[PDB]
Amino acid sequence: SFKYESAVQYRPAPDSYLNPCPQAGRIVKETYTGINGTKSLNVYLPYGYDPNKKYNIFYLMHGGGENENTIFSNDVKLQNILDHAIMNGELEPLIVVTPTFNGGNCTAQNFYQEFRQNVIPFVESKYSTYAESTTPQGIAASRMHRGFGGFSMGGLTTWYVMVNCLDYVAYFMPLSGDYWYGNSPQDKANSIAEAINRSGLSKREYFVFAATGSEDIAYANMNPQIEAMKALPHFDYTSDFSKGNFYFLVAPGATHWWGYVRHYIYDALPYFFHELEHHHHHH
């Protein structure tokens, strides 16, 4: 049963977590048409998915040169980690969506627009999230149970989703990617601060769990951005999200590779979706 730590440390999932679990969540390949044309994504449904229950939802973006199938492919096997963690009770059941920034006019930077208009309404009208409807109002009212994360170029996607979708999303997991809006770490932090100001949200209503490896080149630009954000009043640094809203996990020795990055998700995802949650839990 999960308890927050204030400075959680990197820990890979056990090797057995990388093999198939008997309690396997169903993965559905979807196709939809949006502002960037006809595209696909995958939806991971937790084992025992019951559409008359409501589930947290976490959208997770691939990196450069990859696609909507990568994260659940043999090259990453994230679903095995998800299956084992949910079965063992370390992670509460949730829906995980793997879309793509490929296709049409879509880019890693501009994906948030298609995310808002097409991806959320398509996925969350079909599956049971906390969204009672998928109008802008219904999506905004369920923001505390929606998260976005991604690796590398997908980490960049995550930062742009954050700056442009605080109204829709409360939890952010940028992995090995920095925010490319500004000519200094301070410009970056200030853009995020301004987005937060504009949203009207309190510090108890958005959470950032960032991560990378100590040997991942993304560290060079992330670390200064993280330090500049620490200095804002908008962030209270600690992985204990019952107390603060901002943490940066750096895995010793880890390089720029999904082999390591999948473990950041195993470490970080169980931290999401407990603040103002509808279940009665002690974390």
UniProtKB/Swiss-Prot annotation:
One term of GO molecular function: endo-1,4-beta-xylanase activity
Disulfide bridge positions per record: none
Domain of life of the organism encoding this protein: Bacteria
Keywords: Carbohydrate metabolism, Glycosidase, Hydrolase, Polysaccharide degradation, Repeat, Signal, Xylan degradation
GO terms, biological process: xylan catabolic process
GO CC terms in record: cellulosome
Protein family: Belongs to the glycosyl hydrolase 10 (cellulase F) family.
Protein name: Endo-1,4-beta-xylanase Y
